[PDB]
Amino acid sequence: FKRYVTDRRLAETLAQIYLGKPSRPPHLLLECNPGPGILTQALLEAGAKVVALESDKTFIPHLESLGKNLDGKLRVIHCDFFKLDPRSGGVIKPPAMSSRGLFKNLGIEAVPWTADIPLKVVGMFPSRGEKRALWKLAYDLYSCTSIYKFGRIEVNMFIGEKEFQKLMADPGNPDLYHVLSVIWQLACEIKVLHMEPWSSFDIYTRKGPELLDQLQQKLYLIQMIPRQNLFTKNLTPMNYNIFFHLLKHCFGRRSATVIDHLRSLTPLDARDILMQIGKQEDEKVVNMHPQDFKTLFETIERSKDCAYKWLYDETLE
Amino acid sequence: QLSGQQQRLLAFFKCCLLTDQLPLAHHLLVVHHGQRQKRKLLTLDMYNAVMLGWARQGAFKELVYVLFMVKDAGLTPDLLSYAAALQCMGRQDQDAGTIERCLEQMSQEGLKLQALFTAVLLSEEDRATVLKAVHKVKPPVNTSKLLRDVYAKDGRVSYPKLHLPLKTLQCLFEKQLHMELASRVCVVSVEKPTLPSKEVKHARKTLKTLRDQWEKALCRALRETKNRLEREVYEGRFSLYPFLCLLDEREVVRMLLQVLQALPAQGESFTTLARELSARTFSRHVVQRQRVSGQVQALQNHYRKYLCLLASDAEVPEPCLPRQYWEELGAPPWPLPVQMELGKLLAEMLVQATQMPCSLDKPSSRLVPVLYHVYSFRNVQQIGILKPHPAYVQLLEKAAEPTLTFEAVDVPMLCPPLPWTSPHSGAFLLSPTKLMRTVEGATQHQELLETCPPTALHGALDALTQLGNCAWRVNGRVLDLVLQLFQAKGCPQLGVPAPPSEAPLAHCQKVAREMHSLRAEALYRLSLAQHLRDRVFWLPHNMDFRGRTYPCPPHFNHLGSDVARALLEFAQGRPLGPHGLDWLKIHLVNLTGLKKREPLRKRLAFAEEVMDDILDSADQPLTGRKWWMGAEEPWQTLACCMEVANAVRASDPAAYVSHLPVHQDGSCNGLQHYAALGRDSVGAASVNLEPSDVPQDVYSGVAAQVEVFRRQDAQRGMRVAQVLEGFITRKVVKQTVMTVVYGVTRYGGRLQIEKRLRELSDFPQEFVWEASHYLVRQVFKSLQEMFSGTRAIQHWLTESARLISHMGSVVEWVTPLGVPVIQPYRLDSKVKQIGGGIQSITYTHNGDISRKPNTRKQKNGFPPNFIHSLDSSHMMLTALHCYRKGLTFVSVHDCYWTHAADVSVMNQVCREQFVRLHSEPILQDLSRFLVKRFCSEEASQLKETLQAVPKPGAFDLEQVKRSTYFFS
DNA sequence: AATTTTATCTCCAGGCGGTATGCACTTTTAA
DNA sequence: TTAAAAGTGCATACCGAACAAAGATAAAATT
């Protein structure tokens, strides 16, 4: 399901945090699932270049008429961010539009990773596909394809309570500290911009406008801006699969030491590798910092005099 | 009733009996009986096994003590308990008062002494000793209607003979026995003809030194593990010491070294290395037990006397079926938890004990395991994988070992198979082979096979025997060409996979992985074929759980690809005679597939039309017109054209003797049985089940009906039809209709129609969803009009299966021959897992009769299973009635092979048996059996669903005899 | 009764692994 | 001497995710 704002005050409060946060005028907004468009009305009275991306064709005419009547900058392109750039098939159904064509007709182009931010993406996360969307975004970001093919883009989205706690989990909270937390926190400077109680929104189901638990579940608006130096000499979009496997393996046995996982993952001397990163041999996995994982991976990958370094030949699937 | 610990303790007691570690078993039994809670695990069977183990030693006081414990526990001794005491005295030579007391005690149970022999399955030596002790004081023929003619002695019988002398057959049997006792086969590798270099020498030397270090390390690990498990035995605990004392230390070391060299470079799951190590241990155990027990000599003499039946020069007083002669001449496992635990221990011992230098490049200071334990992730689940060290893999490929290694079962027999006298005994001489292929713990198929009346199974068993007796040999001239292609360049269009070295990035790597798997299967099958190029070999056969028959050697048989069927040919020969060459040419045309719609006359004429191409292809298979590669099956067509050219270039075609097989495939056999059961009138004419001058193809008929519907809809000005213009063809709709017997639904057929449309470039992509939805219902309505009885039968079978599963039982039925069949579909609800240091294996308890029936898979498999059972019954009937007339007969599940000169004869019975097979009321008998079995105990719905059998159509089955294209 | 959910093509030999949780008992350890 | 902390045995739940989907439909599961 999906939810959209039904209150003038809530949309007004969202307007300045969405638009006035970047003091630079020229940032256009790629809003996702406008719904009725009241939030789009707030962003339009704010004066931003709101590019509505409606999932279906039902509410496009209303928004398009509103944008064209006053010559407002409200281009309701028929696309959905959830289904953007699907690998399956060759013919793309218009609701699932290829990223290249969407950016070409939108008018934005590519920028270097070290360069500044091209644009900003806003909206709300899927009600029940938060993990799926997070994994897709992480895969795209680390592979440097799809939306992040053109440049680092903020993703200012509301997320549920449980997913937010699992995302912000740290070695100080090993109960929920998992691979998603590491992969996201190594890439995006996640910071909660706003927090709201879900009873404010209105849930618009398939027919139209669990449930109580969702309403009491506070949604956190989270901003993900990719780090400037995420990709390095050793950590590259081609090698991200090995790193993903290492992180998913090390959390297979959470109540275990890194030194034993290294034996399962590499033929190199576990103690010698652990000595380089300045860590004791008796170190649990859940006590490893997300930056420590990246340092470990880069240390392993930097073996000067050897021929084999890994046991992930893609045969594992 | 069988708990996890109870099965393990019971297997421990039997294993200690087998290896005569009676003090250990006695101590452990005493420990378990000491504790109150631990005693409840013990049952009467454990006590009986323990005392029987002591009886063979003659220790009477131990038997007294165990009887005292049994009496104390409250368990009532049974016949076997007294039998063990009776057989102890015979070896001990005790006084007659004890025998008198033991005999009198049985009066409480009441069963007599001969009742002890009949009820208890005592060993022959045990029976003799019991008879000696008690002396101090005190073949049928199946009468089934369908198989009456096969087993009737009165009449004319012309059972064929092999083409080999008795001396040669006995020498071959000796060779096969020696090879099976060694339990390994060494085969030269077809790939890598030669590699003389310094680096390969260095790799070989390093590999040899490593193998020495590994064997010594594994010997030490074996000794340490045995000592550990022994000290756990002495602490009043279960262990696996006897299961490690069954085999010699060196044998287990050779085992583990062979398994390690058999591990692929891509790793393998732990639950697989566990299952295969346990199975190999059991095979070596039974082979060694038969070797030391002396049954090898009894089998040797009985086989040397039995070979006179099949020998050419030799004769018998009265010719009979090989099973009957074997019977008249004088007739000579572990629970799944134990098997799984034993495999893990060996696998862990293999991974831990072995070690290698980290850097083989130059002269590493440290040692690292050869095998690594990694995790593979599939969605939310994970799998343990044992992957070799990449340096070890590089060493393997650099060594280029010239010899492979095959298990005893993998290689085809060099001597005729043993007759299938019983579900227990058959096929291989020494190694064990189950009749019905199934999962390891599955014991509900063999249970029904054994509990059936002994006469009923005969028709099945004899059939399998014949399929095993058929000789084979390797086609040299075809094999030379295949070897030439495989070694140098390959030809993926033809079927020979390209070498890994030659060029086939992620797409490139996936292509590389499939190509490497295909190249590995080819090295295994071409190496076997090269090894058996100058030897006659046999292939035993066994059934699946429904009734179909498959060869036992998997790596090289006639159920394979084009090359597999191309190399094989009959070892014997028959002269072509009058009609042989016509059938050879018809078979050639059938292999080409160009003239599928034509009558036999047109195919025979077309064969004469293109004779020049056949001669040129046979003479120059690779430097001529190369017409043979254009066929649907290129290698089979090449073999057939070579045979036909040799036949026509001879002085007399009728005198030419041809070893080449000839196939007579059925037309949509599953539909052929649907039509017969339902007596469908319109459907039968479509499936060639009614006489006609031209073959009738169901595929083209369905395509024509769909095209007629398309034109009718286009006349209505509908865009979906207007898009289609000549797109409807048998190619588009063949896959959808061929699986109708399998129970495919609209959803499933739509995916295949979409796949077929996808290659079609002319068709616009936007209409794919709409077109697939259109074609699906058009095809389904076409089949509903042509096949209505088929749909009624499928619905009735599925509904009956669903109701049976809802009632809480699996679906079982008796085939018309008499073989019973039960469906193996149950729900894996409770998790079963074994705790180990390296990893906790998750396994399924295949033999759990407590599990709830799986209603989806039960009701979704009943109709295709029933049709495959009927297909197997028909195949068996034709095989037996062909054998009665001296016919060589081997069948790929519906494709009957025979000699060229014999083809017509086979047809004459192939139809006739069909006519009688469905002459019996199959559906009414099935309904009666299901009512008697699943409804003799909500039952109203089950009874009504089974009592209402679809009404038969209007059709006379006898006209199948005159049908010309029923099987062609 | 009645909304949702989920499977949708048979066989030829097949299954996630870890962590935490409670229970019911024997067993090594406390005075 | 007597009570107990430590330990062994079993079941039992709960967690961990890439990669569209467009209708139909019918039983089973859920309400």
Question: Would you give an account of this structure?
Answer:
Chain A: It is found in: Mitochondrion. Chain A: Its EC number is 2.1.1.-. The structure holds 2 chains of a larger assembly. With 317 residues, chain A is α/β, with parallel strands linked by helices. Chain A has 2 domains: 222 residues, Rossmann fold; 62 residues, rRNA adenine dimethylase, C-terminal domain (Helicase, Ruva Protein, domain 3, Orthogonal Bundle), CATH 1.10.8.100. Chain A is built from 12 helices and 9 strands. In chain A, the strands form 3 sheets. Chain A has a 5-stranded mixed beta sheet. In chain A, strands 1-8 form a two-stranded antiparallel ribbon. Chain B has a 3-stranded antiparallel beta sheet with strand order 8-7-11. Chain B has a 3-stranded antiparallel beta sheet with strand order 14-20-19, covered by helices on one side. Chain B has 968 residues and is mostly helical. Chain B has 5 domains: 131 residues; 257 residues, T7 RNA polymerase, domain 1, CATH 1.10.1320; 160 residues, Orthogonal Bundle (Helix Hairpins); 106 residues, 5' to 3' exonuclease, C-terminal subdomain (DNA polymerase, domain 1); 168 residues, no CATH class. Chain B is globular, with a radius of gyration of 32 Å. The interface between A and B is medium-sized, with 21 and 26 residues.
Q: Reading side by side through the largest sheet of chain A, how are the strands ordered? A: 2-5-6-9-7
CATH architecture of the largest domain in chain A: 3-Layer(aba) Sandwich
Count the domains of chain A.
Answer: 2
Number of alpha- plus pi-helical segments of chain B: 41
CATH superfamily of the largest domain in chain A, by name, is Vaccinia Virus protein VP39
* Alpha plus pi helix count of chain A: 12
Radius of gyration of chain B: 32 Å
Strand content of chain B: 5-15%
CATH topology of the largest domain in chain A, by name, is: Rossmann fold
Helix content of chain B: 40-55%
Shape-level CATH architecture of the largest domain in chain B: Orthogonal Bundle
CATH class of the largest domain in chain B: Mainly Alpha
Q: Supply the number of structural domains of chain B.
A: 5
Helical coverage of chain A, percent range: 25-40%
String of helices and strands of chain A:
EHEHEHEHEHEHHEEHEHHHH
From the helix content, strand content and strand pairing of chain A, which structural class follows?
A: alpha/beta
- Compute the separation of the termini of chain A in Å: 31 Å
Sheet with the most strands, sense and barrel status of chain A? 5 strands, mixed
Q: Sheet bearing the most strands of chain B, described?
A: 3 strands, antiparallel
Overall form of chain A: elongated
Catalytic activity (chain B): RNA(n) + a ribonucleoside 5'-triphosphate = RNA(n+1) + diphosphate
Family (chain B): Belongs to the phage and mitochondrial RNA polymerase family.
Keywords (chain B): Disease variant, DNA-directed RNA polymerase, Mitochondrion, Nucleotidyltransferase, Primary mitochondrial disease, Transcription, Transferase, Transit peptide
Enzyme class (chain B): transferase
